[PDB]
Design a binder for this molecule. Structure first.
Ligand SMILES: [Cl-]
Length: 155
């Protein structure tokens, strides 16, 4: 088992296999819309996608309402917000839990194998081409500090 064995409903309601990302590097991020981190993070994540997307990399953004309830809106609203405000071009998924008993199994996998579970919005896991977690950061770590770790993995 690895991260790319899991399935998730995308933000438009279409079920997808994360197998479609195998061979690629992924930055798996739990997102929120009303957070203090929201604007800086969405801007940095989109720039990350712009710069490293062409090197077989994606941000995989999963909305989550668990942390301060800063993602209360519908999947439709969240997508509209991300696309119109930040010109987001990375994959976005339907709102999920990332922690607790009801967490998405893919997020159970990332927490169990990394030893860290998300404790706020905008936690970030780096997944290697083979679907294994090689890094995890909390939202206070800048995308300037995360990015070089991603470029190390891409070709
Ligand atoms: Cl770099």
């Amino acid at each position: 088992q690895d991260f790319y064995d899991f399935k998730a409903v995308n933000i438009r309601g279409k079920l997808v296999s994360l197998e479609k990302y195998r061979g690629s590097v992924s930055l798996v991020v739990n997102v929120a819309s009303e957070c203090g981190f929201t604007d800086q993070h969405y801007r940095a994540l989109q720039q990350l996608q712009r710069d490293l997307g062409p090197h077989h990399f994606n941000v995989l953004a999963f909305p989550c309402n668990q942390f301060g309830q800063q993602e209360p809106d519908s999947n439709k609203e969240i997508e509209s917000f991300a696309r119109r405000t930040y010109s987001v071009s990375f994959p976005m998924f339907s709102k999920i839990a990332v922690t607790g008993t009801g967490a998405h199994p893919a997020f159970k996998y990332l927490a169990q194998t990394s030893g860290k579970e998300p404790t706020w919005n905008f936690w970030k896991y780096l997944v290697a081409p083979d679907g294994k977690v090689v890094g995890a950061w909390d939202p206070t770590v800048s995308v300037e500090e995360v990015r070089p770790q991603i470029t190390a993995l891409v070709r």
